[PDB]
Design a protein around this motif. Structure first.
Motif, PDB file in Angstrom:
ATOM      1  N   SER A  36     116.218 -17.639 -42.249  1.00  0.00           N
ATOM      2  CA  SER A  36     115.267 -18.099 -43.253  1.00  0.00           C
ATOM      3  C   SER A  36     113.862 -18.198 -42.666  1.00  0.00           C
ATOM      4  O   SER A  36     113.677 -18.109 -41.453  1.00  0.00           O
ATOM      5  CB  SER A  36     115.696 -19.457 -43.811  1.00  0.00           C
ATOM      6  OG  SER A  36     114.759 -19.940 -44.757  1.00  0.00           O
ATOM      7  N   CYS A  37     112.876 -18.383 -43.538  1.00  0.00           N
ATOM      8  CA  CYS A  37     111.487 -18.495 -43.108  1.00  0.00           C
ATOM      9  C   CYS A  37     111.145 -19.935 -42.741  1.00  0.00           C
ATOM     10  O   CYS A  37     111.314 -20.861 -43.534  1.00  0.00           O
ATOM     11  CB  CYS A  37     110.549 -18.001 -44.211  1.00  0.00           C
ATOM     12  SG  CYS A  37     108.785 -18.036 -43.759  1.00  0.00           S
ATOM     13  N   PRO A  38     110.652 -20.131 -41.509  1.00  0.00           N
ATOM     14  CA  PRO A  38     110.275 -21.457 -41.008  1.00  0.00           C
ATOM     15  C   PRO A  38     109.031 -22.005 -41.700  1.00  0.00           C
ATOM     16  O   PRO A  38     108.697 -23.182 -41.557  1.00  0.00           O
ATOM     17  CB  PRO A  38     109.995 -21.209 -39.525  1.00  0.00           C
ATOM     18  CG  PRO A  38     109.623 -19.769 -39.444  1.00  0.00           C
ATOM     19  CD  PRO A  38     110.423 -19.073 -40.510  1.00  0.00           C
ATOM     20  N   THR A  39     108.349 -21.145 -42.451  1.00  0.00           N
ATOM     21  CA  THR A  39     107.142 -21.544 -43.164  1.00  0.00           C
ATOM     22  C   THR A  39     107.476 -22.085 -44.549  1.00  0.00           C
ATOM     23  O   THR A  39     107.254 -23.262 -44.838  1.00  0.00           O
ATOM     24  CB  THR A  39     106.161 -20.366 -43.308  1.00  0.00           C
ATOM     25  OG1 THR A  39     105.866 -19.813 -42.021  1.00  0.00           O
ATOM     26  CG2 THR A  39     104.871 -20.815 -43.978  1.00  0.00           C
ATOM     27  N   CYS A  40     108.012 -21.220 -45.404  1.00  0.00           N
ATOM     28  CA  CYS A  40     108.376 -21.611 -46.761  1.00  0.00           C
ATOM     29  C   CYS A  40     109.800 -22.159 -46.805  1.00  0.00           C
ATOM     30  O   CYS A  40     110.084 -23.114 -47.527  1.00  0.00           O
ATOM     31  CB  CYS A  40     108.249 -20.417 -47.709  1.00  0.00           C
ATOM     32  SG  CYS A  40     109.102 -18.915 -47.133  1.00  0.00           S
ATOM     33  N   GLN A  41     110.687 -21.549 -46.026  1.00  0.00           N
ATOM     34  CA  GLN A  41     112.080 -21.976 -45.976  1.00  0.00           C
ATOM     35  C   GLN A  41     112.755 -21.792 -47.332  1.00  0.00           C
ATOM     36  O   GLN A  41     113.537 -22.637 -47.766  1.00  0.00           O
ATOM     37  CB  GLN A  41     112.172 -23.440 -45.541  1.00  0.00           C
ATOM     38  CG  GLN A  41     111.561 -23.708 -44.176  1.00  0.00           C
ATOM     39  CD  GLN A  41     111.901 -25.088 -43.646  1.00  0.00           C
ATOM     40  OE1 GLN A  41     111.352 -26.092 -44.098  1.00  0.00           O
ATOM     41  NE2 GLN A  41     112.812 -25.144 -42.681  1.00  0.00           N
ATOM     42  N   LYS A  53     107.187  -9.815 -40.158  1.00  0.00           N
ATOM     43  CA  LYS A  53     106.223  -9.233 -41.084  1.00  0.00           C
ATOM     44  C   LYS A  53     105.959 -10.173 -42.256  1.00  0.00           C
ATOM     45  O   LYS A  53     104.835 -10.259 -42.755  1.00  0.00           O
ATOM     46  CB  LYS A  53     106.733  -7.886 -41.603  1.00  0.00           C
ATOM     47  CG  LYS A  53     105.830  -7.257 -42.650  1.00  0.00           C
ATOM     48  CD  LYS A  53     104.584  -6.654 -42.022  1.00  0.00           C
ATOM     49  CE  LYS A  53     104.820  -5.214 -41.591  1.00  0.00           C
ATOM     50  NZ  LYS A  53     103.603  -4.615 -40.975  1.00  0.00           N
ATOM     51  N   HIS A  54     106.998 -10.879 -42.690  1.00  0.00           N
ATOM     52  CA  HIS A  54     106.877 -11.815 -43.802  1.00  0.00           C
ATOM     53  C   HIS A  54     105.997 -13.001 -43.419  1.00  0.00           C
ATOM     54  O   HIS A  54     105.024 -13.312 -44.106  1.00  0.00           O
ATOM     55  CB  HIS A  54     108.258 -12.307 -44.235  1.00  0.00           C
ATOM     56  CG  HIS A  54     108.211 -13.377 -45.283  1.00  0.00           C
ATOM     57  ND1 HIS A  54     108.497 -13.142 -46.611  1.00  0.00           N
ATOM     58  CD2 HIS A  54     107.911 -14.694 -45.190  1.00  0.00           C
ATOM     59  CE1 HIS A  54     108.373 -14.269 -47.291  1.00  0.00           C
ATOM     60  NE2 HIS A  54     108.019 -15.225 -46.451  1.00  0.00           N
ATOM     61  N   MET A  55     106.346 -13.660 -42.319  1.00  0.00           N
ATOM     62  CA  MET A  55     105.588 -14.812 -41.846  1.00  0.00           C
ATOM     63  C   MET A  55     104.190 -14.396 -41.397  1.00  0.00           C
ATOM     64  O   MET A  55     103.268 -15.210 -41.377  1.00  0.00           O
ATOM     65  CB  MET A  55     106.324 -15.495 -40.691  1.00  0.00           C
ATOM     66  CG  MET A  55     106.423 -14.636 -39.441  1.00  0.00           C
ATOM     67  SD  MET A  55     106.688 -15.611 -37.948  1.00  0.00           S
ATOM     68  CE  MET A  55     107.701 -16.943 -38.589  1.00  0.00           C
ATOM     69  N   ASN A  57     102.070 -13.084 -42.867  1.00  0.00           N
ATOM     70  CA  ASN A  57     101.127 -13.366 -43.942  1.00  0.00           C
ATOM     71  C   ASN A  57     101.472 -14.682 -44.635  1.00  0.00           C
ATOM     72  O   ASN A  57     100.585 -15.456 -44.998  1.00  0.00           O
ATOM     73  CB  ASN A  57     101.125 -12.226 -44.961  1.00  0.00           C
ATOM     74  CG  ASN A  57     102.522 -11.856 -45.419  1.00  0.00           C
ATOM     75  OD1 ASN A  57     103.059 -12.452 -46.352  1.00  0.00           O
ATOM     76  ND2 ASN A  57     103.119 -10.868 -44.760  1.00  0.00           N
ATOM     77  N   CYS A  58     102.764 -14.928 -44.815  1.00  0.00           N
ATOM     78  CA  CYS A  58     103.227 -16.149 -45.465  1.00  0.00           C
ATOM     79  C   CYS A  58     102.766 -17.383 -44.695  1.00  0.00           C
ATOM     80  O   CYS A  58     102.456 -18.418 -45.287  1.00  0.00           O
ATOM     81  CB  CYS A  58     104.754 -16.144 -45.575  1.00  0.00           C
ATOM     82  SG  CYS A  58     105.474 -17.769 -45.974  1.00  0.00           S
ATOM     83  N   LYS A  59     102.722 -17.266 -43.372  1.00  0.00           N
ATOM     84  CA  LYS A  59     102.296 -18.371 -42.521  1.00  0.00           C
ATOM     85  C   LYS A  59     101.013 -19.003 -43.049  1.00  0.00           C
ATOM     86  O   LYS A  59      99.913 -18.604 -42.670  1.00  0.00           O
ATOM     87  CB  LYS A  59     102.084 -17.882 -41.086  1.00  0.00           C
ATOM     88  CG  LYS A  59     103.324 -17.989 -40.216  1.00  0.00           C
ATOM     89  CD  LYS A  59     102.964 -18.229 -38.759  1.00  0.00           C
ATOM     90  CE  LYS A  59     102.017 -17.161 -38.235  1.00  0.00           C
ATOM     91  NZ  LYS A  59     102.597 -15.795 -38.363  1.00  0.00           N
TER      92      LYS A  59
HETATM   93 ZN   LIG Z   1     107.785 -17.496 -45.836  1.00  0.00          ZN
END
Ligand SMILES: [Zn+2]
Ligand SMILES: [Zn+2]
Length: 96
Positions: A36-41, A53-55, A57-59
């Motif tokens: 999972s994404c540690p930013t949005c989760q 690649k996701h994080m 920008n999502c970061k």
């Molecule tokens: Zn994310």
């Protein structure tokens, strides 16, 4: 023209470090199958490579008012919710 040959053993660790996040996320995969994404989760990926690649920008940075405790993505909009709702014009120790 050209020619050549080679052949040696390969006993080295993966791009991951002996104490980095990459390793952590990797496990979640080798154990479950995805990370999972540690930013949005909220959304993960089949592996790290994809996530990176996701994080990339999502970061983003989240905020949270103190007066009430509102949570908005756009800082601007929020910073405005305070001057509007928590409008305390400096006049006196009382209103009237
Ligand atoms: Zn994310
Ligand atoms: Zn507030």
């Amino acid at each position: 023209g050209s020619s050549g040959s080679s052949g040696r053993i390969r006993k080295e660790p993966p791009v991951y470090a002996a104490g980095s996040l990459e390793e952590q996320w990797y496990l979640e995969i080798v154990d479950k199958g995805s990370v999972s994404c540690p930013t949005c989760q909220a959304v993960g990926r089949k592996t790290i490579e994809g996530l990176k690649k996701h994080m990339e920008n999502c970061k983003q940075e989240m905020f949270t008012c103190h007066h009430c405790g509102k949570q908005l993505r756009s800082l601007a909009g929020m910073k405005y919710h305070v001057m509007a709702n928590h409008n305390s014009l400096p006049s006196g120790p009382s209103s009237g």
